């Protein structure tokens, strides 16, 4: 079965036995990358090295990166708690090559650790490569020995990894594992590995040129693989995250595995406790602007979902001093910042619990008053008041309102934002007058 920690230690120790160095985990917040607040994948910290701007003592490197996908293209937040595979904070395993070994090595190195090291079967796996990849389809099939009857040929929406609209990109082949006829889909076959082969130079357009020094970039969400091995149909029912579901049940009063929405709030608390703690640990300080507003929304959401469960008083602060034991083996520095994170998180609670309440009775009444008269959405003025008088993120409102069935009209919200701002000029975070609604969903009202 192997624990989540053993899987990691082994992984990181496997590629060393092949030359790859062990690059310590980089902080989720790139010291000098005003580009992307939080890191999303293992490659992010090595982006320059790949291109070839940052030198490097080695030519190979493995790791387990901390990641937060609470934003944009890689933004699983919207669904967090509504499934069993989506997370804000997650760990990504992998190995990297810089103009060194390519397809073959990456393909073999990832074929051994799966069939001869983790002990996972070899007949219940399905590999996928670039369609016309007579180069990659041949490797998997011939040398590797994967039966041709388990190799699909997909398109870009399935196998064309690009660093950006213009950059190092190439053919990406994934590895799937079957999980019983009962279920099916992407839940029966779990893509527990993505091996990306940086082959071309995508210029300002789509004109691709080969690279006399192709790169490698693979990824494997720990939580995902550390589930199939354990035999759980939920990434949350694993040792490293399960006790967290047991943190809500204890504090709340409900159980896991009875009601849908009840099971949703529970997964939210477990998911957002790991996020805020790892964040606040890497220096992030909650604020009414960007980054500090991100953790604020991840924290605020946890305070709202919990409340639903009936947890009248703060309860997350009793979580941070818990994520430590469940994650101190790999990230020891989580014990030094402990107390610091505990007070930071307890602040957003004491300094933020009752407003969420007085802000909830509001949303239920404005919704009931609306859906009574058949009004499909709440005016932009009915959303603004929650955003200002109660500091409700333009995201949290859109959620609770979706639970009844009424959404929120943005256009109106937009006008309301203008009339207000306009008011000030007649009657830090800096927006545009058209990106008010757009921007306001990323900061607070005391930021506009």
Swiss-Prot record:
<dbReference type="GO" id="GO:0005524">
    <property type="term" value="F:ATP binding"/>
</dbReference>
<dbReference type="GO" id="GO:0002161">
    <property type="term" value="F:aminoacyl-tRNA deacylase activity"/>
</dbReference>
<dbReference type="GO" id="GO:0004813">
    <property type="term" value="F:alanine-tRNA ligase activity"/>
</dbReference>
<keyword id="KW-0820">tRNA-binding</keyword>
<protein>
    <recommendedName>
        <fullName>Alanine--tRNA ligase</fullName>
        <ecNumber>6.1.1.7</ecNumber>
    </recommendedName>
</protein>
<dbReference type="GO" id="GO:0000049">
    <property type="term" value="F:tRNA binding"/>
</dbReference>
<keyword id="KW-0694">RNA-binding</keyword>
<comment type="similarity">
    <text>Belongs to the class-II aminoacyl-tRNA synthetase family.</text>
</comment>
<keyword id="KW-0030">Aminoacyl-tRNA synthetase</keyword>
<comment type="function">
    <text>Catalyzes the attachment of alanine to tRNA(Ala) in a two-step reaction: alanine is first activated by ATP to form Ala-AMP and then transferred to the acceptor end of tRNA(Ala). Also edits incorrectly charged Ser-tRNA(Ala) and Gly-tRNA(Ala) via its editing domain.</text>
</comment>
<keyword id="KW-0862">Zinc</keyword>
<keyword id="KW-0963">Cytoplasm</keyword>
<keyword id="KW-0648">Protein biosynthesis</keyword>
<dbReference type="GO" id="GO:0008270">
    <property type="term" value="F:zinc ion binding"/>
</dbReference>
<keyword id="KW-0067">ATP-binding</keyword>
<keyword id="KW-0436">Ligase</keyword>
<dbReference type="GO" id="GO:0006419">
    <property type="term" value="P:alanyl-tRNA aminoacylation"/>
</dbReference>
<keyword id="KW-0547">Nucleotide-binding</keyword>
<dbReference type="GO" id="GO:0005829">
    <property type="term" value="C:cytosol"/>
</dbReference>
<keyword id="KW-0479">Metal-binding</keyword>
